[PDB]
Symmetry: C3
Subunit: 335 residues, 3 copies
Amino acid sequence: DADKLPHTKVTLVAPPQVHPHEQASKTGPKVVEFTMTIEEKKMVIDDKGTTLQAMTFNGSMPGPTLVVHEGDYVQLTLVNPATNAMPHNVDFHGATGALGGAKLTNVNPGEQATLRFKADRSGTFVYHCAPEGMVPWHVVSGQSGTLMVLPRDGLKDPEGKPLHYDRAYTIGEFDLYIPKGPDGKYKDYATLAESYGDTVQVMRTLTPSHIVFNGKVGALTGANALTAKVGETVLLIHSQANRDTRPHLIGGHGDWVWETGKFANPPQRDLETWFIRGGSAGAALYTFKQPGVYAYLNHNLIEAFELGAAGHIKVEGKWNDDLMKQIKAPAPIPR
Amino acid sequence: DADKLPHTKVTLVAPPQVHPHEQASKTGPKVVEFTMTIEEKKMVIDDKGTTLQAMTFNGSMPGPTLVVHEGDYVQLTLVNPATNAMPHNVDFHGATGALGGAKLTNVNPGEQATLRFKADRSGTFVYHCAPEGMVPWHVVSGQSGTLMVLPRDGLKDPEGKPLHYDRAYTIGEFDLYIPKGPDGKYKDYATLAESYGDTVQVMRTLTPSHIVFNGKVGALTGANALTAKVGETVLLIHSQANRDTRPHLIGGHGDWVWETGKFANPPQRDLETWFIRGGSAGAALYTFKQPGVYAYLNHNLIEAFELGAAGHIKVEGKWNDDLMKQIKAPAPIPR
Amino acid sequence: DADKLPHTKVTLVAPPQVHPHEQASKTGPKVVEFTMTIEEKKMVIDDKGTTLQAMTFNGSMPGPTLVVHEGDYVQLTLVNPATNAMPHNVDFHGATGALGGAKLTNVNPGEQATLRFKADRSGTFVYHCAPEGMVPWHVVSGQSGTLMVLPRDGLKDPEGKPLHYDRAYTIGEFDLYIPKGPDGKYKDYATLAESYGDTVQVMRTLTPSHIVFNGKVGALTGANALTAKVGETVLLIHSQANRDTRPHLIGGHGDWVWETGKFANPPQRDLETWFIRGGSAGAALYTFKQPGVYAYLNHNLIEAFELGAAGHIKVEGKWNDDLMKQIKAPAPIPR
Ligand SMILES: [Cu+2]
Ligand SMILES: [Cu+2]
Ligand SMILES: [Cu+2]
Ligand SMILES: [Cu+2]
Ligand SMILES: [Cu+2]
Ligand SMILES: [Cu+2]
Ligand SMILES: [Zn+2]
Ligand SMILES: [Zn+2]
Ligand SMILES: [Zn+2]
Ligand SMILES: [Zn+2]
Ligand SMILES: [Zn+2]
Ligand SMILES: [Zn+2]
Ligand SMILES: [Zn+2]
Ligand SMILES: [Zn+2]
Ligand SMILES: [Zn+2]
Ligand SMILES: [Zn+2]
Ligand SMILES: [Zn+2]
Ligand SMILES: [Zn+2]
Ligand SMILES: [Zn+2]
Ligand SMILES: [Zn+2]
Ligand SMILES: [Zn+2]
C-alpha cells in the first residue's frame, strides 16, 4: 500500500544529462515525486533559419528523463500555464490503465493535475502527450521523453553477471513535418494554431522535412558534444515516439544492447547497428577503448547527413596501436 | 505416412474471431481438412465513401485464421468460382516446397484444387495469393491471412513454464494504394481490371493512401470493438503481408511476445511496442489488470490516427488503485 | 602483439561467391592481408537501359566479402587509381577507433594506404566508403560490402551445439536514387560529378527509384541464379548499408538466423521473414529438403517485384511427397 511508504522529491535536469540516481540500491520501495510544466514555443531548428511551432515538456526536446527503481511509485504533478493556448495531458508507456494516465491528466491552460502509478516493470519507456483528436500533432511537435525504471539490483548480462554505467546520456530523435510555400521555401507561422492544417498535409505524406536529435540540426556538436574518456562505460538512451530509427556509433559498437528497451530480457552483444521501433525507447552500453571524436547517428545515412539525425562524442585518453594502426600513410602508388 | 492418419474437418470462422481449438493436446498427428473460396468484391474503406477494388479469401480482410498442431498435415481445398474474373492460388509461409504451394494451386475461374503439406514448424505464419506476374497487386488488394501451428504441449516461457490464453483475436493490417483524379478526389472503378494501371503507379511511390485493420477505417470500434475482462489473458495475432508495422496497447503491455512469430524461440517480456516485419505474423499475450477502453494501434501515430491503423478493446471489471490513482484532479494552479 | 604473428595473403573473389576459408580451425591468430581497388564506372541497372553513375570496391556491387577468424588482424591495402576523379576511404564496422579506419585511409586519385585492425568480435559487419561531406552519396552509389569474422570453433546453436554450411553466398541490396527529366524519363549523365546535385534532390525524398540485388534488376536470375542441392546447407549473407530490408525464401525458411549478424548471440529458428537494419549485415542458414526454383526476395513485395529486390536459387534433387503433395490438380468445380 503506497499511502504507507516514504516519499522522496527529485529535481529534474535538462537533456542530454540525466538526474543523479543509484543503480543497485538497498533501499525499499518509495513514492517518488516529480513536477513538469508544458511550454508552447516557436524554435529555430536548422542553419537556414527554419522555425518549428513546438510543444514541449519543461521547455526542451526531448522532455527530461525520469529515473526510479522497479516497485517504486511515480507521482507526477503536470502544470499547464495560462500563457499556453492548448489543452495537454500525459501517457506513460511505463504505466497500467486509463490510457497510460492520459484520461486522468487532461489540463486546460491555467490548470494542473497529480497522478500516481506503480512502476512495476523494468526498462526504458516513452512518455508523450495524447489529447483526444490531436495526438500525432502534439507528439511530432516535440512532446515526448523517457521514464527509466532500473531493476533494484542493477543491470545484468544474459548469464546474470553485473553490468554498470559511469555516465548516462539521453537522446530524443524527432521526425519533423515543416510545410513549404509556392516559392519552395519553408513557412513561418505567427501562432501555433495557424501551423496546424498545413502541417497535417505534410504528415500524411509520411516524409519528414527534417530529422533531429534534441531539438535542432547539430544540437549535439561543438561546445555541446557528448563527452567521455577511455575506460569509461556510457549508457546511451534513445527515444523515438513516432518513427523507426537505427542507431550506430562510428568507430565503436553496442557492447550490450536492449533495443526493445526492457531490462528483464537478456541483452545482445557486439552490435554494429541496433533498431528502435517508433513508439519506444531502447538502451545501449559501450566502454571506450580509443580516444577521438566519434559520431553517433541514424544509419539511414540520408536521414543522418542530409536531414539532421547525427551528433558527436569527444573522448579523451591514450591511443591503442593493438586495436588499430596505420601501417602505411596515404602516398603515391608505387611504379 | 499421412495416408494412414485420421482425418478431421474444421469449419472456419470470420475475423476477428478464431475457430475453436485445443492448446496443449494428448492427440497424435491428424490430417486436418479446410476449404476456402476466393471472392473479388468492391468495398467501402472509410468515412468519405472511398472504395477499394478488393480480392479476398472467404469474403473477408484478412482471410480466416487456420489452427493446427505441430506434426499435423494441412489439407486445403481452394475454390475459384466462375463469378470471378482472375486466376488465383495460395503460398503458405508455413509450408516447404513449390513456392509454398503456389505452383500446385493455380486455379482459373470455374476451378478448384486440393493441396496437403506437413505443418512441421510451430508459430504464426502468413498465407497469401501469388499468381505469376501479379503478386503485389493481389496481396495489397486484400488476399492474406494467418496459419497458426501450436506446439503439441502448448506455449512456453523462456524457462519452459506453461503459458495460456483464454481467448484469441486475429488482426490483419492492410496498406492500401488508392489512386486520385485531377480534382484530387479518390477514384471509383467499375471493374477490378480497370483499377490496375493507376494502382501500380501509386504502389511504386511506396506511400499508402490508407492503412486499415480488418478491411476498413474503424473496423474494430463501436459495436465491433474487441472485448475482454479483468483477469483474462488474450492472444493478439497480428499479420502484415507487405509492409512493416509496430503494435502497441495503450494503457497496457505485451507480457510475453514473439514478434517474429515462431514459438520454439523464447518470447520477450514487458514490451511497450513490438515489430512485425512485412511478410510475417507475430503474436502477443496480455493479462488485463484494469477495466476500461484500451486502444490497440500501429505506433507510427500518423499511420494510426490519420491513415486508419487503430482499434479498441473494451474491458469489464473492477478498478485497481494500487496500479494507478488520480491524486489531484485537474483544477486551477494554486496562487 | 601483431608484429610477431605469421602473415597470410588472401585472394578475393567476386560476389555472389565468397573466397575459400575454414570454419572451425586449429590455427592460432594470423595477420591476414587483402588488397582492394576503387573503380568509378557508369553501369546499366535495368531492362529499359537506365544507367547509374556508380562507385565500387573492386568493380562490383557489392564489394567482395572478406573472411577471417576472431582474434586475427585484418590488414588492407586500399588503392585509388589515377583514372578516378574523386577521393575515397574505408570505414569497417568490424573495427575499433578512428571512424572505423576512415580517418587513416583518405586516398586521392593516384594514391594508396595500408590499415591494420584487430578483428576481435565475431559476426558479419558492413564496410563502406565515408569521405567527409560526401558520405551518403558514395554509399548509395555502390561502395559497400561485408567482413565476416567467424568464431575460432565455428558457428553454434542456442544450446552450444555445432552448426555448419556447405556453401556461402553474399547478397548486397542497393537502394538507388536515379533522377528524371521533365519528359518523365530517367537521366543519363556524362560524368560522375554531373549526377551529384540532381541525385541529392531524389535522395532527400527518401523514395528509391530502384532497389536491386548485386548491381542490377535480375542480377541473380537465369544463368546467374544461385545454386544448391537437396541435403546441402547454405549460408546467405545479406548486407544493406543505408536502408532497412526484410529477406524471405519462397518455399523455404531461415532454419537458424542472426538477423543483427553477431555470432556470439544465440540465433532464432523457423523464421518466415527476417530483418536487416540499414547499416548492417545479417546471416541465415537453410538446409534444402525439396528440389525446384526458389525465390529469395525483400518481402515488401512492391520493392521486390516492381523495384528489383529479388533473385532465384535453382535446387537439384528428389521431390518429397511427405512434406508436400498435390492431392487434386486444378479441375472444374464439381456440379
Ligand atoms: Cu500536448
Ligand atoms: Cu504511446
Ligand atoms: Cu489472387
Ligand atoms: Cu510471401
Ligand atoms: Cu568513395
Ligand atoms: Cu557505417
Ligand atoms: Zn504517502
Ligand atoms: Zn509528499
Ligand atoms: Zn528507488
Ligand atoms: Zn566503469
Ligand atoms: Zn559529424
Ligand atoms: Zn488419409
Ligand atoms: Zn477426408
Ligand atoms: Zn492437431
Ligand atoms: Zn487465463
Ligand atoms: Zn480510438
Ligand atoms: Zn608482422
Ligand atoms: Zn606481409
Ligand atoms: Zn584465421
Ligand atoms: Zn552439410
Ligand atoms: Zn522470379
